[PDB]
Each structure stands twice: as structure tokens, then as C-alpha cells.
Amino acid sequence: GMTEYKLVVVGACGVGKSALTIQLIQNHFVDEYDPTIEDSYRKQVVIDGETSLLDILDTAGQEEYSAMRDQYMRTGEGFLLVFAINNTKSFEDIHHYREQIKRVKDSEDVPMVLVGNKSDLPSRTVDTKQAQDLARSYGIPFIETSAKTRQGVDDAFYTLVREIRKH
Amino acid sequence: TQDQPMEEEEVETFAFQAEIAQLMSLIINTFYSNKEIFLRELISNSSDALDKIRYESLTDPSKLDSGKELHINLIPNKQDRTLTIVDTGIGMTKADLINNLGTIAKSGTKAFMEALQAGADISMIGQFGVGFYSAYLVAEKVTVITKHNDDEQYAWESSAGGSFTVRTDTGEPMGRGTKVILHLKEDQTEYLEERRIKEIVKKHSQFIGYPITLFVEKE
Ligand SMILES: Nc1nc2c(ncn2[C@@H]2O[C@H](COP(=O)(O)OP(=O)(O)O)[C@@H](O)[C@H]2O)c(=O)[nH]1
Ligand SMILES: [Ca+2]
Ligand SMILES: [Mg+2]
């Protein structure tokens, strides 16, 4: 085979998990994608000169903790923790996602990037300072993104790959 | 030689989202053999609120400065026929009550009623994030008193029938956290017995990692 990084995108319903994934893989913006569709998407990239497959698990379906679901999430080598800057509950839920990754990988040392998505919109309810304070407490990078304009999208996924090489 | 003191409270009435009202009508009207799980759902919700204190501590260290223990207290009252659950968690803002307890629970609401139609047990309610409504298995009325730092004390109240109220609470100050008061149905006073409560908590909650204390009134 060839070099593969298995990245998992997690976060509340509507934060832009699918929009970020599709912008990365297919370079276009979807205004509404079935919230129940959970798939992995593959794309060849070159990062700091290394050619690899990104296998991106776009988390969806429903909240459950079957042995099947746990095994599937455990294969994730790195996690994008996505919240939307206009949705305060999505930011609060970051702690939940962090807990469950901590749980299945039995470590506080899992590669993760915090992503503040929908940075294009004017209706901010979560300040960047709060997001950076949280990222600092976990020891992870924080990226501002807009899946709509593609600003920060490659930055977020490539940073997560770099995070996985270090660990 | 003073004038008559009198407090004033603004009260607002709200409709439940249609699907929460359907679930509440199903819970109130139907007998469930496994209804003891209501107490596990109250303790689990207190646990979520106490976890929020620790999360906030990560980025706001002033949380560390409170001298309050993080704990859950169970207080049966046979005279009043009430079961009260008190925690020292983060508490809710007024926006939380109007939203958390009458709209935001909406997605697992429909999914839980289809699970019940499919033959699932009432005990699965907690996995759909709507465990709070299990209080209506054993209570004809629920009051929630809550205090969030930098906000006022609020009381939420519903006897089901499709609406709830939220008011500023000028009563007994409770300090940071949430108090849930179950006004038990006449036929559900078993859940005020020290022995029944000890059985239920010995069985269901198992691995909640905050102290739980039962207060028994000496007869
Ligand atoms: N304005 C804006 N809208 C976005 C952005 N990302 C996603 N959306 C929209 O927000 C909604 C949810 O996106 P989706 O990717 O389905 O969220 P998911 O539930 O986390 O997979 C859709 O209507 C998207 O078009 C963004 O960066 N900016
Ligand atoms: Ca939880
Ligand atoms: Mg999606």
C-alpha cells in the first residue's frame, strides 16, 4: 500500500464536519448534506514533500457506543474537534468529544486540532480567546476555518497530519 | 413601624415543543414496570452539571476558588410527599431553562418514542439524552430551582398538560447549582423510603464519581 493517515472529523450536528471534508476532498461547498450520512473519503496530498492518502472519517449517524462504533472510532490516528463560531453549545460539546477520544485511545496524548468553523459569518457567539484558552489547556493547535470560502481548510487537516507525525 | 414588605416575580409561560409534549403525555399516562430508573436519570443529570464545573475550571481557574464540595443530596420528605435532588453543579441561566427544558432535547425525543414503539424499555431514555422527562413516571409536578454564577435564581415548573413556567425565584437562596423537586403521585410514595432509595442507587448509578448523600428525617 502507500502512506495513509486516518483522520476523524467530530463535533455537534451542523458545525460543518461534512462541508470541511467535502471542501478538502472535492474543492466545493455544499449548502446542505444529509446529516445522517457517515462515510470515509480518500485524497492524495503532498505534505512537507511526503505523498500520502488522507482517509477522512466524516462522523455522523447517531450517538451510540456499540463495540462496533468504538472499534471504528479507535482506528482514527488524529481527530478534528469542530465547533461553529455562531453556536455556543457546539463549543461546550468539545469537552464531550475530547472525553470519548481520550476514552477509546486510553491516552491524553491523541493527535487533535481544535477548529472554529463558519468564521465567514457575522453572528459570532464564541470568542477566539475562549477557543485558544481551551486549545492551550489541552496542548493542541487551534485553526479558524470557513468551509464556505475554504479559508483555513487545508491548514486544519495538514496541521493534524503534522500533529500525528510528532506523536 | 415599616410598610408591608412584598416581593414581585415575573412569570412567563411556554409551550413544550410538540414532540416533548407527546413524550411527556406517553410517560405520564402509561405504567412502566422498570420506572425506578427515574432516580438514576436525576443523579446522571446532576453528574453532567458537576462535570461542567470541572470543564470550566480548565480555562477559568476562579472556579477552583469556590469552597463548595461537588456532591449530590437526596432529600425525601414524607409529610410533603416530595423527593428533592440537590447538586452543587454549574447551574442554568434563564435561556438554558427555556431551551434545555422545552426545545433542545428535541432530536432524541422522536428517536426514543420510535425506540419504545420498536419494543425498547423506558430504561433506554437516558441514552437518548431526554432522561429528565422520566421524572413524570413518578411525579405529577416537577419544580427545578437553579443558580448560575453572575445570574439570578430561576424556578421552572410543569404539571405536564403541554406548558411550563419560568420565573425569577425570590425564595430561599440555594447558591450555585440545581434543585429538582418531584411532587410524587399518591401511589408512588415507595420512592421516599430509605430502603427503596438504597436499593435503586445500589443498582443503577454504580459508577457516578461524585459523593451521593441520602438525608433521612428521624421519626
Ligand atoms: N456560512 C458557513 N456555513 C457553513 C460552513 N460550514 C458549513 N456550513 C453550513 O452549515 C450547515 C451544516 O453543514 P454540515 O457540513 O452538514 O454540518 P455537519 O452536521 O457537522 O456535517 C450546512 O448548511 C452547511 O452549508 C461555513 O464555514 N460557513
Ligand atoms: Ca454525557
Ligand atoms: Mg455531516
**SS3 of chain A:** CCCEEEEEEECCCCCCHHHHHHHHHHCCCCCCCCCCCCEEEEEEEEECCEEEEEEEEECCCCCCCCHHHHHHHHCCCEEEEEEECCCHHHHHCHHHHHHHHHHHCCCCCCCEEEEEECCCCCCCCCCHHHHHHHHHHHCCCEEECCCCCCCCHHHHHHHHHHHHHHC
Q: Which residues of A touch B104 (CB under 8 A)?
A: 89
Residues 6+ apart with CB under 8 A from A15: A82, A83, A84, A87, A90, A117, A118
The answer to whether residue A62 neighbours chain B at the CB level (below 8 Å) is: yes
Residue of A10, A18, A63 with the most ligand 1 atoms within 8 Å of its CB, for mutation:
A18
Burial of B157 (0-12, 13-18, 19+ CB in 10 A): middle
**Rounded to the nearest whole angstrom, what is the distance from the C-alpha of residue A30 to the centroid of ligand 1?**
8
Contact in structure between B112 and B128 (CB atoms under 8 Å)? yes
Rounded distance, CA A108 to CA A99, Å?
Answer: 9
Class of the B10-218 domain? alpha beta
Contact in structure between A18 and A58 (CB atoms under 8 Å)? yes
Question: 3-class DSSP state for residue B214?
Answer: strand
Contact in structure between B121 and B106 (CB atoms under 8 Å)? no
- CB count, 10 Å around CB of B81? 17
Each domain of chain B, given as residue ranges in start order, spans: 10-218
CA atoms in the 13 A half-sphere facing the CB of A109: 4
List, in sequence order, every residue forming a beta bridge with A55; answer none if it has no partner: A6, A42
Contact in structure between A87 and A38 (CB atoms under 8 Å)? no
| The CATH number, out of the four listed (3.40.640.10, 3.40.50.450, 3.30.450.20, 3.40.50.300), of the domain defined by the range A6-164 | 3.40.50.300
Contact in structure between A152 and A145 (CB atoms under 8 Å)? yes
Question: 3-class DSSP state for residue B80?
Answer: coil
If phi > 0 it is left, if psi is from -120 to 50 it is alpha, else beta; for residue B27 that is alpha
B28, B83, B90, B204, B208 from B34: Cα distances, Å: 14, 18, 30, 11, 20
Contact B104 A89 (CB under 8 A): yes
C-alpha cell at A110: 491523541
Rounded distance, CA A82 to CA A97, Å?
Answer: 10
Alpha-carbon Rg for chain A in angstroms: 15
- Choose from B56, B57, B58 for mutation: most chain A CBs within 10 A: B58
- Could you tell me which chain B residue has the CA closest to the CA of A133? B59
The answer to whether residue A127 neighbours chain B at the CB level (below 8 Å) is: no
The pairing of strands B72-77 and B82-87 is antiparallel
A41, B7, B18, B170, B171 from B10: Cα distances, Å: 53, 10, 25, 10, 13
Neighbours of ion ligand 3 (CB under 5 A): A 17-18, 60
The C-alpha cell 465547533 sits at A83
φ, ψ at B107 (rounded to 5°) = -75, -45
Residue type (1 letter), A152: G
Strands (E), B79-120: 82-87
Rounded distance, CA B155 to CA B91, Å?
Answer: 12
C-alpha cell at B19: 414532540
- CB count, 10 Å around CB of A62? 12
CA atoms in the 13 A half-sphere facing the CB of B178: 25
Declared resolution, Å: 2.0
Contact in structure between B175 and B53 (CB atoms under 8 Å)? no
Rounded distance, CA A29 to CA A18, Å?
Answer: 10
Chains A, B: CB contacts within 8 A come to 17
Reference B45, options B162, B121, B125, B120; nearest CA is: B125
Reference B132, options B118, B148, B146; nearest CA is: B146
Question: 3-class DSSP state for residue B78?
Answer: coil
Contact in structure between A115 and A81 (CB atoms under 8 Å)? yes
φ, ψ at B151 (rounded to 5°) = -135, 170
Method in brief: X-ray
Element (H, E) at B44: helix B37-59
Contact in structure between B196 and B38 (CB atoms under 8 Å)? no
Q: Which residues of B touch A63 (CB under 8 A)?
A: 108, 127, 129
* Cα dihedral: B100, B106, B110, B116 (round 10): -10
Alpha-carbon Rg for chain B in angstroms: 18
Reference A5, options A77, A101, A74; nearest CA is: A77
Burial of A1 (0-12, 13-18, 19+ CB in 10 A): exposed
Q: A98: Cβ below 6 Å to ligand 1?
A: no
Question: 3-class DSSP state for residue B169?
Answer: coil
B64, B172, B178 from B61: Cα distances, Å: 5, 28, 22
Question: 3-class DSSP state for residue B57?
Answer: helix
Contact A95 B55 (CB under 8 A): yes
Rounded distance, CA B168 to CA B165, Å?
Answer: 10
Rounded distance, CA B217 to CA B47, Å?
Answer: 25
Contact in structure between A82 and A11 (CB atoms under 8 Å)? yes
Residues 6+ apart with CB under 8 A from A37: A18, A58, A60
Burial of A167 (0-12, 13-18, 19+ CB in 10 A): exposed
Q: A121: Cβ below 6 Å to ligand 1?
A: yes
Rounded distance, CA B70 to CA B47, Å?
Answer: 9
- CB count, 10 Å around CB of B192? 21
Rounded distance, CA A126 to CA A167, Å?
Answer: 30
Rounded distance, CA B116 to CA B128, Å?
Answer: 11
The answer to whether residue A36 neighbours chain B at the CB level (below 8 Å) is: no
The C-alpha cell 472510532 sits at A73
Contact in structure between B182 and B136 (CB atoms under 8 Å)? no
Question: 3-class DSSP state for residue B89?
Answer: coil
Contact in structure between A135 and A128 (CB atoms under 8 Å)? no
- CB count, 10 Å around CB of B137? 23
The C-alpha cell 475550571 sits at B57
Residue type (1 letter), A135: A
